[PDB]
Amino acid sequence: PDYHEDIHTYLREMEVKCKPKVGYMKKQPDITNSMRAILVDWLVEVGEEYKLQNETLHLAVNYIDRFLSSMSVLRGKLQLVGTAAMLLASKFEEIYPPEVAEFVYITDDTYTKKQVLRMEHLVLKVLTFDLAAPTVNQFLTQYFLHQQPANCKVESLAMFLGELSLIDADPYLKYLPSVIAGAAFHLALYTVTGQSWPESLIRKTGYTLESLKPCLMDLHQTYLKAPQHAQQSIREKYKNSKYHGVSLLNPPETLNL
Amino acid sequence: PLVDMENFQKVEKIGEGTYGVVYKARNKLTGEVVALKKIRLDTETEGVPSTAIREISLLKELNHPNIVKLLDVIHTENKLYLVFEFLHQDLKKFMDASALTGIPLPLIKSYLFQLLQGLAFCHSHRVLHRDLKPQNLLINTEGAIKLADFGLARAFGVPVRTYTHEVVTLWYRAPEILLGCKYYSTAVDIWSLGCIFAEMVTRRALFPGDSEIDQLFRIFRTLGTPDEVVWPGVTSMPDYKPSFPKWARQDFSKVVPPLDEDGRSLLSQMLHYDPNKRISAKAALAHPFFQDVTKPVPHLRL
Numbered sequence A: 001p002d003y004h005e006d007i008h009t010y011l012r013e014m015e016v017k018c019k020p021k022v023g024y025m026k027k028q029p030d031i032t033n034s035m036r037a038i039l040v041d042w043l044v045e046v047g048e049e050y051k052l053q054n055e056t057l058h059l060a061v062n063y064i065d066r067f068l069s070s071m072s073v074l075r076g077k078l079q080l081v082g083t084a085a086m087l088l089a090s091k092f093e094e095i096y097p098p099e100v101a102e103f104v105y106i107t108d109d110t111y112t113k114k115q116v117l118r119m120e121h122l123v124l125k126v127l128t129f130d131l132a133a134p135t136v137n138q139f140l141t142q143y144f145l146h147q148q149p150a151n152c153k154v155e156s157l158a159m160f161l162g163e164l165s166l167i168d169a170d171p172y173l174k175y176l177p178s179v180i181a182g183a184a185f186h187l188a189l190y191t192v193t194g195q196s197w198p199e200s201l202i203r204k205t206g207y208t209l210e211s212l213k214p215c216l217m218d219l220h221q222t223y224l225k226a227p228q229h230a231q232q233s234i235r236e237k238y239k240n241s242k243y244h245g246v247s248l249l250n251p252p253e254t255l256n257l
Numbered sequence B: 001p002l003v004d005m006e007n008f009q010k011v012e013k014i015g016e017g018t019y020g021v022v023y024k025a026r027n028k029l030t031g032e033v034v035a036l037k038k039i040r041l042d043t044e045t046e047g048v049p050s051t052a053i054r055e056i057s058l059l060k061e062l063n064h065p066n067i068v069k070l071l072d073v074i075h076t077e078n079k080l081y082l083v084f085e086f087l088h089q090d091l092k093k094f095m096d097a098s099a100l101t102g103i104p105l106p107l108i109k110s111y112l113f114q115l116l117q118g119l120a121f122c123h124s125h126r127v128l129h130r131d132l133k134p135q136n137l138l139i140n141t142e143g144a145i146k147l148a149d150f151g152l153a154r155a156f157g158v159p160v161r162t163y164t165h166e167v168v169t170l171w172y173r174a175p176e177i178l179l180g181c182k183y184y185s186t187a188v189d190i191w192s193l194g195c196i197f198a199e200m201v202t203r204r205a206l207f208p209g210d211s212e213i214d215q216l217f218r219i220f221r222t223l224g225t226p227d228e229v230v231w232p233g234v235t236s237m238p239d240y241k242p243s244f245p246k247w248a249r250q251d252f253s254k255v256v257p258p259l260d261e262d263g264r265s266l267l268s269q270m271l272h273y274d275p276n277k278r279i280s281a282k283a284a285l286a287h288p289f290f291q292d293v294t295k296p297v298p299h300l301r302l
C-alpha cells in the first residue's frame, strides 16, 4: 500500500494526543496498579470467551486509562468502567459486537444493563467520542510489513509481548505505543530468529535500538518474570495453537545491547 | 444537552432511514443553518449504535473541504444528535434531475476530482468509507461535493475483516469482495468511485446487479472474466468457481462513449481487477484527465 507512510506519520501524531496522565494512579484515592492489572487480565479472559480481536482489547485499555486520568473511581465501580470500555471498543472494532446483555453477563450480574449503558454514555462524554486511538497493535501491524522473511512465530511473540505491557501501568504507561511496539518487535525478532531491529524500520520510525533500550530493558524484565506474574491470562492465551504456543518459548538471558 | 437542543429550530425533514432522521435546522442564536441527524436510542436498547460510534469518532478526525463537517454532538437521555454543516442535495437526486440533459463533462470532472481529494484524505488518515454511492455524496450550489454518511466507515490501523454478510451496496461493490476476499482495502472505495464516475458519464449505473452472482457476472461481461494473468490469485479466492463463463473485455470506448482517451484511461485504472494494482486516490489526482479541471456550478433544481 502507499498510504503506509502517511498513515504511520498520522498514527505517530495521534498517539501523542490520546496519551493518558502517566501518574494518574497516585492521584486515585481508591484504586491501585494491582487492581488495574486484575481488571485488564479479566478483559483478556472476556476477549477469549467472546472471541474478540486483540485490537478491541488494546482499545479498551486505552479508554480505561484515559478515563481514569480524569475521573476518580472507587473499587466497586472499576469493573463497570472496564466493562463499558470493552463494550465501546467492541462496537468500534468488531464486525458483530456482543450485545449489552452479554457484557452484563460476564460481570456476573454485578451491574445492571442500565448501569452499563449509563457508564457507556459517561465514558463517551469523558473521552469526547474520541475512540479511534492508536494502539501498540496498530504499530506492530505497520512494522510487520518491514519484516523481510515474514515469520508467524515472530509476529505471535511480538503480539504476546505487546499484550503483556497492557497489564502493568508501571512502567508501561510512560512509553508511547510506537515505542512499546518497537521493543516488542525487536525482542520477539531477537528471541525467535536472533535478528535485530531492522534498518528499514529505523528509517521508517526514526527509532534506533539505542532509543528503544529503556523500554526494551523493561519489556525484557517483564518477559523474564512472566511466569511469576500474578496475572496469567495472557500467557495462557498465547500457548494456544493459533499463537504457536510462543508464551512457552524461553526468553533470552541477555539482549546484548 | 437539553439546553443546546433548545437553541435549534427544526425547519423540515430532509431524509430518513434505519439510523433515524436527518432534519434541516437553524441555530436560533447565531442563525447558522445546519443538518441534524437524529438517532433514537430507546429503539433497540443496546446503547449508542455502532454506526454512530464510528461516524462520530472517525468523522471528527477528518477535517477536509470534501468531507461533510461534523459540527457537534448532543447526547440527551433518549436521543443522540449529530450536527453537520448543511448541503442542499445528494448526487443521486442530482443525477435523476439531470437525466434529460446529462451532467456536463466539466462538472463531472470537477466532482470526481473533489471526491478523490476527500477520499485521499480519508485513506491517508486510515479511514475506509466502504459505502460510497450517489446518495452518500453531498453537493451545494457553489459546485462543491463532499463525502458523507460514515456509518459504515472503519479505521484500518489494523486490517478490516470482511463481513460474512457484505455491507457495501451491491451495484458499487468491488469484485474482490464478491469473490470473498478476507480483508477490505482502500481499493474497494476507489472501485465504488469508478462506478460512480461512469454512471455520471453515461446516465446509467455501470453494474446494476440483481444478486451477488449477477453483480459479479455483469462485471465479467464488461471487463472480461479475470484470470491468473490479469489478477494473480483470482482462481484461488473463496467464492471463485472455475465454471465461471469466460467473457472477453468489452471495448472501453463503447462502455463510456462520451469519454476521451484520458477519461477512459483513468476509469480503467479505477476498475482494475487486482486491488493491489487498482489506482489510488492519491495517484488518480495526478492523472492527466484532471489537467484542465475547473469548478463549474450545478443547476440545482431546489
Ligand SMILES: NC(=O)c1nn(-c2ccc(S(N)(=O)=O)cc2)c2c1ccc1[nH]ncc12
Residues within 6 Å of the ligand: B014, B015, B022, B035, B037, B068, B084, B085, B086, B087, B088, B089, B090, B093, B138, B148, B149, B150
Ligand atoms: N445520512 C446522512 O448522514 C445524511 N443525509 N443527508 C441528506 C442529504 C441529502 C438529502 S436530499 N437533498 O433530500 O436528497 C437528504 C439528507 C445529509 C446527511 C448528513 C449531513 C448533511 N448535510 N446536509 C445534508 C446532509
